[PDB]
Enzyme design. Structure first.
Site, mmCIF file in Angstrom:
data_model
loop_
_atom_site.group_PDB
_atom_site.id
_atom_site.type_symbol
_atom_site.label_atom_id
_atom_site.label_comp_id
_atom_site.label_asym_id
_atom_site.label_seq_id
_atom_site.Cartn_x
_atom_site.Cartn_y
_atom_site.Cartn_z
ATOM 1 N N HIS A 117 -6.362 4.961 -5.740
ATOM 2 C CA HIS A 117 -7.000 6.167 -5.225
ATOM 3 C C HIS A 117 -6.407 7.432 -5.829
ATOM 4 O O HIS A 117 -6.839 8.563 -5.462
ATOM 5 C CB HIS A 117 -6.968 6.195 -3.691
ATOM 6 C CG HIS A 117 -5.607 6.387 -3.075
ATOM 7 N ND1 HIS A 117 -4.893 5.357 -2.504
ATOM 8 C CD2 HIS A 117 -4.849 7.497 -2.935
ATOM 9 C CE1 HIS A 117 -3.744 5.831 -2.028
ATOM 10 N NE2 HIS A 117 -3.695 7.128 -2.278
ATOM 11 N N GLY A 158 2.000 12.648 0.089
ATOM 12 C CA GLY A 158 2.769 12.592 -1.135
ATOM 13 C C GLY A 158 3.571 11.318 -1.306
ATOM 14 O O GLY A 158 4.094 11.071 -2.407
ATOM 15 N N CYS A 179 2.407 8.194 -1.136
ATOM 16 C CA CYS A 179 1.684 7.067 -1.690
ATOM 17 C C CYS A 179 2.318 6.648 -3.009
ATOM 18 O O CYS A 179 2.729 7.477 -3.812
ATOM 19 C CB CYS A 179 0.217 7.412 -1.876
ATOM 20 S SG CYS A 179 -0.593 7.426 -0.261
#
Ligand SMILES: *[C@](O)(C(=O)NCCc1ccccc1)[C@H](C[C@@H]1CCNC1=O)NC(=O)[C@@H]1CCCN1C(=O)OCc1ccccc1
Ligand SMILES: *[C@](O)(C(=O)NCCc1ccccc1)[C@H](C[C@@H]1CCNC1=O)NC(=O)[C@@H]1CCCN1C(=O)OCc1ccccc1
Ligand SMILES: [Cl-]
Ligand SMILES: [Cl-]
Ligand code: NA
Lengths: 305, 306
Positions: free
Chosen positions: A41, A143, A145
């Site tokens: 993503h 932030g 991920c």
């Protein structure tokens, strides 16, 4: 003596963390050999995040759409591909800090260390368990991920988790490093409920053994039980069933303490039925279930990496 | 979201850990630049541990009596000096992995990360607090001496603890990196015992603020308290006194949540009176006191979940 929630030393993983940017989106990547792994993503806008067609968003992208930053050095992307929910960015440089490693997929009940990262910079380390409902109770902000979870065995890092999501109850969901989600979750901005959770019985028993090893014994009693009777109590209190394999797996701790598993099961049975009567075990008023049998033995025997 | 006991990434400290052997005795040392720091009791023998005369033991040692091993590499000791309860071994090689670092002596209530090591090899990392009685509640086995505690705010390693002892209650004592013990303890096997410990009140309040930030308000109430009335009550539960310094330190968390410090004190007073009545706060059924105000701001969102 003493017993603490203990994480693996994180230095071998710290050397692999990088920053990945695609458009206005920035998150963390894992740099091993000449490939950077990160959540797919990263290619998304917010409009895409409702119903992303990852297939079409990726064929639109090119190598030049990705900016990879290792410390203060840019890594040139020379190829890209998708594997399940992970993006693989081939870069022009092999990571000279690449540890001995493998990708593994863990089972519910197993524990691992999380290296929480932001903008490619490690921020903290803590220990988690994969819950029976396939979430983890992490600590993650926007932030984070691309942060990863791992175990270490001697010199070999076994990567088992990459962070992707926070669910409405504040627990967290992610994938293995081959991009397969743990749990019935998908990578898109929709409400997805964590299922009702249960307690990890074998881990509670392991932690009771740790308590005995550390001198906390008030809950021991004269009674024993059978798997069938205990498992009826387990089901009543939303505990996972206890299998013969769990009994075998508790062998080393049963050998270290000289206490039989069905002996300890009778102790846990009474704790569930009567509570703790105002007492604590290893400094907790709850029955702790995020220590595995291996975690207890390793900590009580000073195993080193 | 979430709230965990969060340690600092340990890599910068891992690269400094070595093994020190003198005689039949092995423990851990910390290799910074061309100096290896370790507990001075590495020079002791079985008899000497009740009333060791460290000055007399050390003058009898040659540089080659100290075997220092960095992984598989032997480091050559070229000098030594004792500073308080720490031995400093000069070696002929500077550690190329030496991070930016400083030595800081911390106050009770402060937290830090511990990298537990055996034979110079790291075993695990966890968070600790310096208790009001100058002990720490660690996880340490024989061979862990010389393991260190540290913080890494802003990419600088602040070393604040070196492990030396386990007391009879199963808690742990050690020194700063200048070799001065925290608390009234000495590196002798003579009968010692920690003083009665207390709960770190300012940290409990910080953690109650963390719970509000993460979206939980069930424990608040409509009351307030004076600072002096709060301390009169809290000390009846063996809580440390709350000072105006502590109230000031909690200011930023008070601002972010909109809950006045003394109103949070009133919540805590009621929680001590009532217990949690089957509920939890941030996953715990007890009031947690090993998160500092700084720790909460480090870990939590800057935006409260109202
Ligand atoms: C994680 O994606 C992240 O760190 N994002 C960094 C910046 C960015 C990347 C891609 C796209 C935009 C921005 C983020 C981490 C979460 C946020 C708070 N705590 C965490 O652990 N995860 C997400 O935002 C993921 C990505 C897919 C959707 N999603 C998510 O968490 O959905 C939950 C949700 C939120 C709002 C409404 C409905 C569902
Ligand atoms: C620590 O010294 C250690 O790891 N020793 C490893 C091998 C060794 C090195 C030097 C000298 C001898 C042996 C050890 C760590 C403890 C043991 C169990 N858990 C720990 O954290 N610490 C000690 O043994 C220290 C050294 C001075 C005395 N001492 C100690 O713990 O004594 C306990 C005590 C006894 C009576 C009264 C008060 C305290
Ligand atoms: Cl301090
Ligand atoms: Cl009460
Ligand atoms: Na029993």
């Amino acid at each position: 003596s003493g017993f603490r929630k203990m994480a693996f030393p994180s230095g071998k993983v710290e050397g692999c963390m990088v920053q990945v940017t695609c458009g206005t989106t920035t998150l963390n990547g894992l740099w091993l050999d000449d490939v950077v792994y990160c959540p797919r993503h990263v290619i998304c806008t917010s409009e895409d995040m409702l119903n992303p067609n990852y297939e079409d968003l990726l064929i639109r992208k090119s190598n030049h759409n990705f900016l990879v930053q290792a410390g203060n050095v840019q890594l040139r992307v020379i190829g890209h591909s998708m594997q399940n929910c992970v993006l693989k960015l081939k870069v022009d440089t092999a990571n000279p800090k690449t540890p001995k490693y493998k990708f593994v997929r863990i089972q519910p009940g197993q524990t691992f260390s999380v290296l929480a990262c932001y903008n490619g910079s490690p921020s903290g380390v803590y220990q988690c368990a994969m819950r029976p409902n396939f979430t983890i109770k992490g600590s993650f902000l926007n932030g984070s991920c691309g942060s990863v979870g791992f175990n270490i065995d001697y010199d070999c890092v076994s990567f088992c988790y990459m962070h992707h999501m926070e669910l409405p109850t504040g627990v967290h969901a992610g994938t293995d490093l081959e991009g397969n989600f743990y749990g019935p979750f998908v990578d898109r901005q929709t409400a997805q409920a964590a299922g009702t959770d249960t307690t990890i019985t074998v881990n509670v028993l392991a932690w009771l053994y740790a308590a005995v090893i550390n001198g906390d014994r008030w809950f021991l009693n004269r009674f024993t039980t059978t798997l069938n009777d205990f498992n009826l109590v387990a089901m009543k209190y939303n505990y996972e069933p206890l299998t013969q394999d769990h009994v075998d797996i508790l062998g080393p701790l049963s050998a270290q303490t000289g206490i039989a598993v069905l002996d300890m099961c009778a102790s846990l049975k009474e704790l569930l039925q009567n509570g703790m009567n105002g007492r604590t075990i290893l400094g907790s008023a709850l029955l702790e279930d995020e220590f595995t049998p291996f975690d207890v033995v390793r900590q009580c025997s000073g195993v080193t990496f």
